[PDB]
Design a protein around this ligand. Sequence first.
Ligand code: SF4
Ligand code: SF4
Ligand code: SF4
Lengths: 628, 628
Amino acid sequence: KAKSIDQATLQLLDKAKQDGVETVWDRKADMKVQCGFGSAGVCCRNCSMGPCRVSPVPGKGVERGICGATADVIVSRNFARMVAAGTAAHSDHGRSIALSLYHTSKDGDIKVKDENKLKEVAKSFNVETEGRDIYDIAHDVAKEGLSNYGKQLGEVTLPPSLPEKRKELWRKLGVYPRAVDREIAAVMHSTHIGCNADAEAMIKMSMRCSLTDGWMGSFMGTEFSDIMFGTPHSIDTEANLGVLEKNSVNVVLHGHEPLLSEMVVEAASDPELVELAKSVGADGINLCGMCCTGNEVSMRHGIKIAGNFMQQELAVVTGAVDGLIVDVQCIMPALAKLSKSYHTKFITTSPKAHITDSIYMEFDEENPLDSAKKILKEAILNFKNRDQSKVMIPELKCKAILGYSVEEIINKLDKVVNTQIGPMQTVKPLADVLVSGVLRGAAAVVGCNNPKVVQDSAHIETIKGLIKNDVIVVVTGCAAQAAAKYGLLQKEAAEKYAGPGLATVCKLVDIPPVLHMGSCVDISRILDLVGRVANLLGVDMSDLPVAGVAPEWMSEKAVAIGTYVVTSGIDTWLGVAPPVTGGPEVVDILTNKMEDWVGAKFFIETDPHKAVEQIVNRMNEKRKKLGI
Amino acid sequence: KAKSIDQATLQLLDKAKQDGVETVWDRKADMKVQCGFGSAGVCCRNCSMGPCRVSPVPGKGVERGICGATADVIVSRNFARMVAAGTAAHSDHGRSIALSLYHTSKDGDIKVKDENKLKEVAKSFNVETEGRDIYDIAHDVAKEGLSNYGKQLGEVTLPPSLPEKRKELWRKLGVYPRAVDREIAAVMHSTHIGCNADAEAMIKMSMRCSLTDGWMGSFMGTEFSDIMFGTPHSIDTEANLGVLEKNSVNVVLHGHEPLLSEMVVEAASDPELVELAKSVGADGINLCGMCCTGNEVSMRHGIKIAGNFMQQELAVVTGAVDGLIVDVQCIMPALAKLSKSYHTKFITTSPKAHITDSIYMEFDEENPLDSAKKILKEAILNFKNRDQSKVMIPELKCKAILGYSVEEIINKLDKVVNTQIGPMQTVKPLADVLVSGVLRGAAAVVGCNNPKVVQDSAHIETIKGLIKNDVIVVVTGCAAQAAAKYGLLQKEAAEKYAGPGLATVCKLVDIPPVLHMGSCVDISRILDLVGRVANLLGVDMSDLPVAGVAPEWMSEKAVAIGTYVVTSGIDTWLGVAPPVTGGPEVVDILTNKMEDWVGAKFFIETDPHKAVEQIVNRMNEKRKKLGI
Ligand code: SF4
Ligand code: SF4
Ligand code: SF4
């Protein structure tokens, strides 16, 4: 089968074959037929009595592990641990952001750039703002956010966009969230040998844990990032590997933590570093981003996006990356080995993400700007080691428009508001187009790449099908970057791919049919948006014609995201089967019984066209339930 | 191979074969040859690009996972997740204890029974005590303990017995602990795909996480349990399955959390329940404990111990267990199936541990005594369903002495203190016998059973070898219960098994050669003891001739325990190989490089006699280093 639908990706794969280096596709081929027990989730290693593998087919073979655990128990515990790991990644990101907020000052490297957003957040956290210094408010808000992570007494703080009905449903179900780290610890405790051996209770614990990701960790990370670095607005950028410059220093920012990439962007305008780039024979400094850190700097500053997850290696294959600076998460360790075949300096910066044989330059949060400057200086000085005979940059780049935060979307919707009617600054125009049926619904396309799927194929096919069916699409993460590379993040795309209702809406509001809402933590924005719509219509989020899709997901973070999206009341389609087919009870809970609990459920569909059809049918069913 | 060295265990295995019921041994046999990849730790399932298996033999076969992770990376992440799971189990136990402390009242079900212990703990937590109400002090202490779990700013609180040198070494190494749930979340975050791919850093993160178990979670759980339920003192009890009564109601308490078992013990003396037991035709109520909850109630009240981990099923096989009340952890789910073959009521009580097809009676912490009375009444009423023709109780039980908390040990040591010299109430006599060489050292024997080892064989052989070599032995958990069943927890054992120096010490102090220090969380007591000795000698804990042994461990909790014991500076022998042989770098870190870091290291030895020899040699070389 084809490795990708992206032509630049294919050219660089040919180059990697010529250079004798191996990619993620080569390692996937080397893995051959993957273990059936692990693929079905019926393998357990939770204690040293094991490893235990039970039959994925009930009634045949070994039925129980040594402790007596059934296939359903093993599957449910494995699923819960995936959710806990994803929640941990997102919560650690949000915790770093909250600490950065706590360390803001007027004359420091980290300031408050959006005071209005900070005051609204302070209102949401019961922090007084009138007649107060802005940094005192910021510190109080950071304290409340940090308490959300580890409070042992009392209730956590949740955003006002979350409907009261959803909160009450969670409380009745027993999944109402506690402090984030406490829920992660609870999930890890209940999967220990000889604890929870009941699939339904295990799934409910995992949902409870995922809620602390969706509504607390990711939400606080996003809102505090907006406070410190600015709320995203409509902004132009370029996407795909063609953004690399042969005649300039190329600095590629990979990872998830935004403070480092923000400081690197600021350092790139330093006169001394620009002069240094000129002195090593380069035209200038060309910052390019990848994955979620690329999404953040692109949403807030228009930094060009070099590529998504499965392109990271190919960025090095060009031979033009002088410095690849990585913080945490979704950083293929093979990059270190790959960096030996080129001049590239592979720089790790976080104590959480040491990588063997990489150059470690710890990013100092006490002096973020100076630390970023020294890291960037190492990248710039590496330009002298460039071998221009090994350089091949495909001439394939695509224009994209992004920056669609909830605030930006509301500002755009204000155009189609009659002044004599109003109100302004609400999601009411979006609610109106959804209720009238001009738009059939809204769908979130999120997730990673996965060698099991032709890279970016499922993302593009799902998005095109949805917008052709007058479903407005919001995108995050690597799916958003696939849309950017393909050319869907363009106003012109409205008349090229969208159906009649969505084309009319795009023309009236002057937006692309596909709205890039940011990184994987920025999925919280989507929740926020949906919540607002629900609160405007006086219904729960499970009554709306909305859906989420993860066509090509790979990470534990994706599992946690899908779990909290379903738990919030939004049906979720998974384009890659999770390792649960071995447990019939777990499959039945996730795809059938979940609808009785939270009004939504998982759909597993590896065919994107069938997924689009199912999404449209489900949205029409919910519309008929709602009367619209 | 023999299944056990215990004769009562063998008789009940014959009965289980005659009854056509499966045991843990039968399921272990059914599992046959366990997966080599999982056994070596070279299998990874951390993302849905996998499952990935790399060769346990370097230089052959597949070398890297799909993301590029090496065998060392996969092994180190798997080990770290085991540590995180064990830390989560212990920390959740301690968190429940702290919450119970927070709800103590003068006229409530949960009171303060050891005010002196509470005042000393309050001193350790910087809580004022002079001229204050005892329950105000208790609530402040509980608040400080709870803050240890989830504080995001500042430093955690550690017991005064921990040497300053050990803390400084931890700070220099980068493993100084943070809040417990924060460290669990950090480990889970760094094992996520594309985060940490460096074995040394991964092992250091796991050590940092395990410290929050050893010195914060388990320590606080133990000390708060002492405050609420009484400090253990020397007390007599009986051990092994013979403690069951044919003519009495048999109520078996299995699990770890002590509040439920304490309330059940209190409810058993209720006049209405005793009258009800008489009216259902029984002579009375016979409470028996298993595993750690049995250890707690036995340490504090002399409740008879029915058996350790791999005996739990056999307790039901007797046909005499009218009620089996379980809370969390090390509860084989197969019990639910097994109790169908008998009249036994298998009662789950904790929302953390639901077991399918068991009778769920949620233990209400708000009204603990009434809830315990209701559960106990269900067990008593089940006596009418006893089938006395199916009853077979082995006439095999053994006298044991336990209750050796640090306070009790100090009280015993006061006997050999010359009044004209002093001081009293110190560990000084123990330090003196260790320094003079009358005792060669002290060894902690802890851990579970494991079907991979003849049950209780390794525990007994290791203990007998150590005490024969004039090494005083402290025991916890299932190892302590194996010692109890065998008969080592007896004063007479001093003249039957101990060497000359240990026999003299036992005669002078009037103690058994093997000291039962309580449950698995009570391993913190051992740390406390060692710390005091170190603080009395002005040395670090790694300079002492001390060691820990886990001859037959199975649980993730055991992994976390061994990790924090080594990190504290105490060499640890493992009688069951952990899944790390696939990663040569991880093996080298755990067994060789750890000594450079923390002055102690792991020893993997499956032969108990060889383990005793190695322990004696290591203790002698540490003595020669210390000059004693
Ligand atoms: S999933 Fe289990 S059975 Fe399959 S290779 Fe991995 S450890 Fe072995
Ligand atoms: S927890 Fe149970 S099923 Fe899992 S490895 Fe241990 S004995 Fe086997
Ligand atoms: S994290 Fe890497 S090694 Fe582990 S399953 Fe995913 S791709 Fe394979």
